[PDB]
Design a protein around this nucleic acid. Structure first.
Ligand SMILES: [Ca+2]
Length: 314
DNA sequence: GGTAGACCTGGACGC
DNA sequence: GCGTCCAGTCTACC
């Protein structure tokens, strides 16, 4: 009863609602779609993970987003805490307004968007986002998810335990910069990315001015931010774009990887024109990015997630 | 300046 | 069952 991951049906009094139609958000299309790797559908339609240094379980009905927090007496989330959820899902942005625009200037988007509504972008923490995506290169969502889980378990603060799952906060720069972290991460199966994580943690703390440097990027321009990030080991143009888009508030950033290349070729008959190559390359990847920005506008980064999510779900 | 290759790991086909 | 195939970044070299 008071044990294990909660359910809306089982512990009614412990849940609070946030007005939010499914047309505005579909958890099943957002949480497991490569934006964040920290959410699990422990119970059907119920997703749990760490949000703002606390464990939460989220589920939804047609017009409501139901939320519960595990912090000492078990109680429903408070207005303040719920606001933490609204910020995480950037709920002040109306997705229906964005879908309408993208759909009006892109017939193919409109076709796809009819079936995959509610795909929005999570507003993530810089550190978590940086190191999660450093772990993403040349990898698949399933493996990435495990690596990040092992990373947090070995170097992140212990939060609370539900059933046999112990939740951990995301590691700090100091922890990741610690001695012999690479060796350890390597034993956890991060492969060559083990060094990238270690090397990047130290680079930020010992050469860029630390956390302040990363966080300051949220006020910088996309061009600036993307440039700064490419400095770090393991961070190329794709990883830099994912970070800008999902954690540094650069909605025009368009991450280009295998999926967006397939989409561009299959659904837009796209081809590099000013580029020198016919396939993926630093110059062509950049061009593809500009193509989507020119097509969808300032929020091209958000539009991209809709087709990406629909691509995965197929 | 703009390429070819190597690269951790493990679920996938291919045969 | 074994080998190859895949899900970006970095570097040696033209
Ligand atoms: Ca690939």
């Amino acid at each position: 009863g008071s044990e294990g991951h909660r359910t809306l049906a089982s512990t009614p009094a412990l849940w609070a609602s946030i007005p939010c139609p499914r047309s505005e958000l579909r958890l099943d299309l957002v949480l497991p779609s490569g934006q964040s790797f920290r959410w699990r559908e422990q119970s059907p339609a119920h997703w749990s993970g760490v949000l703002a240094d606390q464990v939460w379980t989220l589920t939804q009905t047609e017009e409501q987003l139901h939320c519960t927090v595990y912090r000492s007496q078990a109680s429903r989330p408070t207005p303040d805490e719920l606001e933490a959820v609204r910020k995480y899902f950037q709920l002040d942005v109306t997705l229906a307004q964005l879908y309408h625009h993208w759909g009006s200037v892109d017939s193919h988007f409109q076709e796809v968007a009819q079936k995959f509504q509610g795909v929005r972008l999570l507003r993530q923490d810089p550190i978590e986002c940086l190191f999660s995506f450093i772990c993403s290169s040349n990898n698949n969502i399933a493996r990435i998810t495990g690596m990040v889980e092992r990373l947090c378990q070995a170097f992140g603060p212990r939060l609370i335990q539900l059933d046999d799952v112990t939740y951990h906060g995301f590691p700090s720069l100091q922890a990741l910069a610690g001695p012999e972290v690479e060796a350890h991460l390597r034993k956890l199966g991060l492969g060559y990315r083990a060094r990238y994580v270690s090397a990047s943690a130290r680079a930020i703390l010992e050469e860029q001015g630390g956390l302040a440097w990363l966080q300051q990027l949220r006020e910088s321009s996309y061009e600036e931010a993307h440039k700064a990030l490419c400095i770090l080991p393991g961070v190329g143009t794709k990883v830099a774009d994912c970070i800008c888009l999902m954690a540094l508030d650069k909605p025009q950033a368009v991450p280009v990887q295998v999926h967006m290349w397939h989409i561009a070729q299959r659904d837009y008959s796209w081809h590099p024109t000013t580029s020198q190559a016919k396939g993926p390359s630093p110059q062509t990847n950049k061009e593809l990015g500009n193509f989507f920005r020119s097509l969808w506008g300032p929020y091209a980064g958000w539009a991209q997630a809709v087709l990406f999510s629909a691509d995965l779900r197929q």
